[PDB]
Paper text:
The co-crystal structure of [name] and [name] bound to [name] reveals [name] binding in the same substrate binding pocket as E2. In molecule B, the position of the [name] is well determined because there is clear electron density for the entire molecule, with strong density for the first phenolic ring and slightly weaker density for the second ring, suggesting that this ring contains greater conformational flexibility. The first phenolic ring of [name] superimposes with the phenolic ring of E2, positioning the 4-hydroxyl within hydrogen bonding distance to the catalytic base His107, similar to the 3-hydroxyl of E2. In addition, this ring neatly fits between the steric gate residues Phe80 and Phe141. The second ring is located out of the plane with respect to E2 and extends into a different region of the hydrophobic binding pocket. The bromine (Br5) bound to the C5 carbon is buried in a hydrophobic cavity within van der Waal distance (4.3 Å) of Tyr20, Phe80, His107, Phe141, and Tyr168. Bromine atom Br3 is located in a more hydrophilic environment and is potentially able to form hydrogen or halogen bonds with Lys105 (3.1 Å) and/or Tyr239 (3.2 Å). Overall, the protein conformation of [name] with bound [name] is very similar to that with bound E2 with only a few minor changes in the substrate binding pocket. Binding of [name] results in increased sidechain order for Met247, whereas the sidechain of Ile246 becomes slightly more disordered and the conformation of loop residues 84–89 is altered (2.0 Å shift at Cα atom of Asn87 in molecule B). Although the electron density for [name] in molecule A is not as clear for the second ring, it appears that the overall position of the molecule is slightly shifted with respect to the position in molecule B. This shift is correlated with a shift in the loop (4.5 Å at Cα atom of Asn87 in molecule A compared with molecule B of the E2-bound structure) containing residues 84–89.
Residue numbers in the entry: 2 to 293
């Protein structure tokens, strides 16, 4: 029944488990036409996509908050592979969008449409420690339609460890993007670094995007993109979406916004099981995360 639930909700594409609604029209994603000045923001789900997106949007608008609030974020920054028959269509949104385009995606590098690589588009990749991602993704399953019942948190974590969740293995995702992140066109960031020193990462982002980093611009970005501001901003907190698709009464999208909430969810036994498995998955990579 749980396995049956997963079967009804998700289907594989290129070996990667995916929301079934997306897969039906995957040819649209496959043949997507990039432009050289497109910017890709790529993340494993729940790694702070919304956070870095708004920072990037502010950098584009030279810190003009009104310009950022002119439309909701999922319209300002289309979700590339996302498709709900005719109700939502990321590819369509991008096709009609005036450049310069900012593109959101959760795809592993092997699944990113070839055109982005061919045109050598800049990519910003953001990752977050796996435990915190797992917690966040768990509540996401609960709040959002199109997910199976995730069961108990230990049950969900078992699926997470095996990569049996939308977008597949977090382990492979981050490891693959880490290799790409050696390219000068790909900026590799950590959620935990944005928490620890937001100013340093914002400045890093400004330089990567070839803009000028003034104190005033940097200050505007920092407070506009802080958790408390974004939580209350209807342009960025997804509250304009109805409850029957995103039910924020169960759990808000802007949920806690901290590093270390895994300490509030993993039991000692689950933590031990998770840590052992994690080491085996990640031993052969120089990528290093902080869980606090
Ligand atoms: N301005 C901000 N500062 C810190 N965390 C933020 C943030 N905006 C969104 N997040 C967090 O990023 C996660 C959502 O990620 P995504 O945008 O990729 O779906 C949520 O994590 P939590 O559920 O742990 O609170 C959310 O709270
Ligand atoms: C596919 C999903 C669940 C989603 C949204 C975001 Br934001 C994500 O980052 C990831 Br991952 C998945 C979604 C939810 C609603 Br409600 C929708 O109306 C549509 Br169209 C798609
Ligand atoms: Na790089």
């Amino acid at each position: 029944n749980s396995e049956l639930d997963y079967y009804e909700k998700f289907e594989e594409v290129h070996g990667i488990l995916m929301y079934k609604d997306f897969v039906k029209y995957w040819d649209n994603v496959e043949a997507f036409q990039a432009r050289p000045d497109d910017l890709v923001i790529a993340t494993y789900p729940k790694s702070g996509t919304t956070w870095v997106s708004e920072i990037v949007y502010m950098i584009y608008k030279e810190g003009d908050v009104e310009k950022c609030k002119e439309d909701v974020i999922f319209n300002r920054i289309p979700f590339l592979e996302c498709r709900k028959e005719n109700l939502m269509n990321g590819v369509k949104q991008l096709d009609e969008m005036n450049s310069p385009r900012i593109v959101k995606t959760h795809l592993p590098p092997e699944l990113l449409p070839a055109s982005f690589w061919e045109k050598d588009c800049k990519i910003i990749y953001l990752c977050r420690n796996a435990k915190d991602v797992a917690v966040s993704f768990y509540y996401f399953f609960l709040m959002v339609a199109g997910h199976p019942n995730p069961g108990s948190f230990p049950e969900f974590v078992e699926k997470f460890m095996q990569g049996q969740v939308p977008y597949g293995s977090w382990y492979k995702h981050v490891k693959s993007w880490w290799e790409k992140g050696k390219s000068p066109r790909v900026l590799f960031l950590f959620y935990e670094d944005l928490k620890e020193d937001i100013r340093k990462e914002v400045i890093k982002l400004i330089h990567f995007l070839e803009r000028k980093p003034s104190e005033e611009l940097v200050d505007r970005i920092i407070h506009h993109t802080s958790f408390q501001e974004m939580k209350n901003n209807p342009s960025t907190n997804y509250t304009t979406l109805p409850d029957e698709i995103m039910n924020q009464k169960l759990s808000p999208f802007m949920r806690k916004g901290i590093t270390g909430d895994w300490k509030n969810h993993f039991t000692e036994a689950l933590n031990e099981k998770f840590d052992k498995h994690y080491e085996q998955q990640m031993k052969e990579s120089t990528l290093k995360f902080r869980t606090e």
